[PDB]
Amino acid sequence: ETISKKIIGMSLLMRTFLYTLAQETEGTNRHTLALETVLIKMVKMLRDNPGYKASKEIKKVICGAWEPAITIEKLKQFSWISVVNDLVGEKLVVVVLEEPSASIMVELKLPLEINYAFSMDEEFKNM
């Protein structure tokens, strides 16, 4: 019934965004990152962790045999709009606006409840 058990009970796309955001903001707090940056950082997580079931499963749906690794252009193809809207719906994320130009930025809520879910996720581990 926990927050962390409910995250496991979510989609892979949602979890890869959420886990990347928790991993990219962990350090000097703030917990806010540009949506573009979260996308470049998901690519890095996927390509740097071929061993992950998440990485292997995403690749089978959006990539062919000829393709050796996910690119931003191949990933950008997904509706990051819908995941962002679904995550704000679960009260796990907040959309913040960039100071001069209305650029989308995203704020992680309760990283410890997310990281407790990352730690117990079987699709986010390597051999």
Added chain:
Amino acid sequence: ETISKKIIGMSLLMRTFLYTLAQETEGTNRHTLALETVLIKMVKMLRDNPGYKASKEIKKVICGAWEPAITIEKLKQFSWISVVNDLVGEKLVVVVLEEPSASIMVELKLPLEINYAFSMDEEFKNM
């Protein structure tokens, strides 16, 4: 080196669009269908074939545990633009325009080379 072997060596998203189009136009020829219709027909193929590895794998990336079957709204989230552009690139599809309003329609080229690939695809079979 065959056309059919090169289709297997493609992405799941591309194959589900291609195989659905081959399945939906098989009959009274023409081989042209509205892009919207191809999308509603992919949903039906996925939900009517839970046994397919393709169906099971797509579901893990775009759907959570709470979600029992893929909807048009959950599927529409993908860039059907990119698959359509990649398939025209492989000379396997042609984009045709709807007579009054510039509505996207899609024309299947060589269905027998596609169906020969559908018949030998291990991700498009059930238990």
